[PDB]
């Protein structure tokens, strides 16, 4: 257990409910949480079943003024926020104030692409679903129910990945130089019996 000022979570390969439950508990603990790459979130069950579930969600509306009726957000970040909102006591000022500590986004915008992004093992698809079980991605589900910025995020994410890769090569070179100069120091053996 550890407390960070803000936690940026790479939502790739995570399960919607498992991550939303972990995030919702952290928000109620008073911690600010940022969730990036919401279009890569996974849901158990094949897509068609998930698509039918969301079409059932679209059916809910007020018989008078659907503008009062339930607002069905299509963006993957908004889907994740909806799952978290159903896990927070949002009608209450405590659970409402815990919502503005959550910022779910699609892709990794500039303020967060230069920050460490941790993952939640309790919500990872590889560690939770038996192999061979069908699953869908929220990004593809959103693109079929109305979300219309799928390929823009894909292009911007590809460009960001290239830039991040170039940074990593620079960091690898610097760390390689540090490691090479590390062993030359005689203290490396003077620290050996201490376990360092």
């Amino acid at each position: 257990s550890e407390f960070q000022k803000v936690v940026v979570i790479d939502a790739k390969g995570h399960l919607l409910g498992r991550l939303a439950s972990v995030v919702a508990k952290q928000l109620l603990g008073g911690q600010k949480v940022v969730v990036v790459r919401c279009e890569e979130l996974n849901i158990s069950g094949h897509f068609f079943r998930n698509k039918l579930k969301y079409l059932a969600y679209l059916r809910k509306a007020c018989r008078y003024n659907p503008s009062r009726g339930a607002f069905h957000f299509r963006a993957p970040s908004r889907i994740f926020q909806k799952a978290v909102r159903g896990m927070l006591p949002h009608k209450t000022a405590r659970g409402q104030a815990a919502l503005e500590h959550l910022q779910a986004v699609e892709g990794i915008p500039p303020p967060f692409d230069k920050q460490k992004r941790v993952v939640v093992p309790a919500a990872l698809r590889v560690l939770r679903l038996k192999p061979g079980r069908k699953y869908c991605t929220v990004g593809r589900l959103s693109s079929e129910v109305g979300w219309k910025y799928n390929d823009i995020v894909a292009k911007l994410e590809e460009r960001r990945k290239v830039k991040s890769a170039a940074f990593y090569q620079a960091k690898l070179a610097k760390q390689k130089k540090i490691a090479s100069a590390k062993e030359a120091s005689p203290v490396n053996q003077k620290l050996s019996q201490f376990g360092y």
Partner: protein
């Protein structure tokens, strides 16, 4: 026991007054880099409307190669002045205006757009912008380079020379026109080189194009459900009134539904009427613009006595097939059609035989005063 379809469309409500007087182009044609750089919109003023006689060259029709009479709408379209450019960058949340570059010199007509009270103001708009444009063009150059490098959509700010039209209004109408065709670099170069210059509708539209006309319809004020929604009039025996909807809902749900006809504003709404052919783009200077080839009789588009409540059209005009939204002297937006169309009706060439310029302020009987003096003793 019986059925009847719904009265009215549910896709047009709320039936509230438009929040804008000038039509907003809500969609622009898909950008094709193969096509050359061009404008995809224009802004004119509804002068009036008249009727023409045309030989119908549609094979297989019952009236092929025989005369027909069609009502046409004349819109005065003096050339628009390109005063600026604005860049749009695509984002995961939509288009975002990255930056805007204005021309060095802006006319008084477009400057009046920025003031509610131009008379009392010191007319100080864009003064410091003009100063920085003259003293340091490098900042402008960086702005244009930024548009070329990051922006994926380019729109030219254009205003209309409203002082050329016979209108008491002096604020020039200003809009953004998306520039499709070519690379973003080509669009910026086209925009910058066209700062402070004028673009004529002859360059944009080609005398047969199917365009969309966008404008705010004529306001009818508040109306009842009989007129606003077309419901049936209740019988003469009705108590407390008959020009209304009898039942406004069932017991449950215990509310009036949004789908029930009610009274209120019926008019002054934003419409985008599709598939309007240009029958003729006439030049202002030419004195034979309304005269066809089978008619001779050198004459102008303006009927005798002038366009009712508009005056005399002296500038470039466009003659469209059928009606357009809005009253006379209303600002209308003509945009290129978004859909493709290969119909024989949409592709047949148009060759007019005669254009009516008798007085519309009554029952006109003479086309021109020259033959009016002939008939009258």
């Amino acid at each position: 026991k019986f059925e009847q379809p719904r009265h009215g469309s549910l896709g047009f409500l709320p039936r509230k007054r438009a929040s804008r007087q000038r039509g907003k182009v809500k969609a622009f044609p898909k950008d094709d880099a193969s096509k050359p750089v061009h404008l995809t919109a224009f802004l004119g003023y509804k002068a009036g409307m008249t009727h023409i006689v045309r030989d119908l060259d549609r094979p297989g029709s019952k009236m092929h190669k025989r005369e027909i009479l069609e009502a046409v709408t004349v819109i005065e379209t003096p050339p628009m002045v390109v005063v600026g450019v604005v860049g749009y960058v695509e984002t995961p949340r939509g288009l975002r205006s990255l930056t805007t570059v204005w021309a060095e010199h802006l006319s008084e007509e477009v400057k009046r757009r920025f003031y509610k009270n131009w008379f009392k103001s010191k007319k100080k708009a864009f003064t410091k912008y003009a100063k920085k444009y003259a003293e340091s063009t490098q900042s402008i150059n960086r702005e244009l380079e930024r548009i070329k490098k990051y922006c994926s959509v380019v729109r030219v700010l254009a205003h209309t020379q409203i002082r050329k039209t016979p209108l008491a209004q002096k604020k020039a109408h200003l809009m953004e026109i998306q520039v499709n065709g070519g690379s973003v670099a080509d669009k910026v170069e086209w925009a910058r080189e066209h700062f402070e210059k004028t673009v004529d509708i002859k360059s944009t539209f080609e005398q047969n194009e199917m365009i969309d006309v966008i404008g705010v319809t004529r306001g009818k004020g508040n109306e009842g459900t009989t007129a606003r929604w077309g419901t049936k009039r209740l019988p003469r025996k009705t108590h407390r009134g008959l020009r209304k909807v009898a039942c406004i809902g069932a017991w449950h749900p215990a509310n009036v539904q949004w789908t029930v006809a009610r009274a209120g504003n019926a008019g002054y709404m934003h419409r985008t009427q599709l598939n309007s052919k240009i029958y003729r783009i006439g030049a202002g200077d030419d004195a034979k613009n309304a005269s066809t080839d089978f008619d001779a009789t050198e004459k102008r588009i303006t009927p005798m006595g002038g366009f009712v409540r508009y005056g005399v059209v002296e500038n470039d005009f466009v003659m469209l097939n059928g009606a357009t939204p809005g009253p006379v002297k209303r600002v209308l937006t003509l945009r290129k059609s978004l859909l493709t169309h290969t119909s024989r009706k949409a592709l047949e060439p148009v060759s007019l035989k005669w254009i009516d310029t008798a007085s519309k302020f009554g029952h006109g009987r003479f086309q021109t005063p020259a033959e009016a003096k002939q008939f009258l003793g």
